[PDB]
Design a binder for these strands. Structure first.
Ligand code: CA
Ligand code: CA
Ligand code: CA
Lengths: 161, 161
DNA sequence: GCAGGACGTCGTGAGACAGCTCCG
DNA sequence: CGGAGCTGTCTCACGACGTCCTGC
């Protein structure tokens, strides 16, 4: 399993060529709350260095999806989902620096997600942390995410609250 | 001094946001061989994360030059010269992946620098390793370096050989 | 004559997603 | 429905220097 200096390297790389992010995705097929909250970490690189992704994917138990070419000659590696992530993030957080907060927020969401699914109220708190993470991945001079505001309205103007 | 996972993190980050390069600089004031060979590693980042550079810089022994703003809102940290590098690289080499070759080429260069100085022949070998590093930092589809060819002819047409 | 630091930059290699599709 | 993998992209944030400037 994952060694320390192996975990700290990955953290160092993630912090440079990588991403920890959360998004609110539309779910027309759903019932009450028509949005699944997605969670991910990703590594990005020019396709010719793909084997270096392959590496970081092997050491991480081969969780996630390797892509030798998004299409624009860039290769990447995305790990979706609270399952992979509840196992991966904790190994990395201690060494993460730039994206530590983001990671700690992802876990935060993972710990709150279960009871948040069918509770429109507690789901708003969850969606807040989606704003926090996206915000973290912004310059302090850009528009700030607003899924929380844009969804409380859809909520109210629909009965759920 | 520099702890293992600390060096591993830095290796990971250097492999992502950083750079190990060598360049042949002209010196109109030098006597025979009017080129100093320059060696460096650097770390690049948006100026709102300077403290993470400050961090790495403190961790290395405060060697190098932090620059809160190059001028285009991007901050960077650059370590010039065999002296810092002969101290820093060895700590990083074991955890470097993508740029490990570059790092060794720099050490190799530092190893031959002394005798290469006033030997136009041995300077040409040392110049070849400069071509090799710049080459490493290139797609395999761009013009390849050749300070070697451009300096051989120069030497020849000037008597040095 | 030597070497270290500052200044500026062209050109992409990234980041952080939105949207799409598929799964049992 | 409930989650998870595949497709494509705008917009910058990097890389890898070249170039001028120091001081002794
Ligand atoms: Ca980066
Ligand atoms: Ca990179
Ligand atoms: Ca980068």
């Amino acid at each position: 399993t994952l060694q320390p200096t192996e975990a700290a390297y990955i953290a160092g790389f993630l912090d440079g060529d990588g991403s920890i992010y959360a998004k609110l995705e539309p779910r027309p097929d759903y019932k009450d709350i028509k949005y699944q909250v997605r969670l991910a970490i990703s590594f990005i690189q020019r396709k010719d260095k793909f084997p270096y992704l392959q590496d970081i994917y092997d050491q991480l138990g081969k969780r996630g999806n390797l892509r030798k070419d998004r299409g624009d000659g860039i290769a990447d590696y995305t790990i979706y989902g609270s399952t992979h992530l509840s196992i991966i993030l904790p190994d990395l957080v201690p060494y993460l620096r730039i994206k530590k907060k983001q990671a700690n927020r992802i876990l935060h969401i993972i710990n709150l997600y279960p009871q948040a699914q069918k509770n429109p109220s507690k789901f708003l708190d969850l969606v807040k942390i989606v704003d926090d993470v996206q915000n973290l991945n912004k310059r302090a001079d850009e528009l700030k995410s607003t899924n929380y505001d844009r969804l409380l309205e859809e909520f109210l103007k629909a009965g759920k609250i």
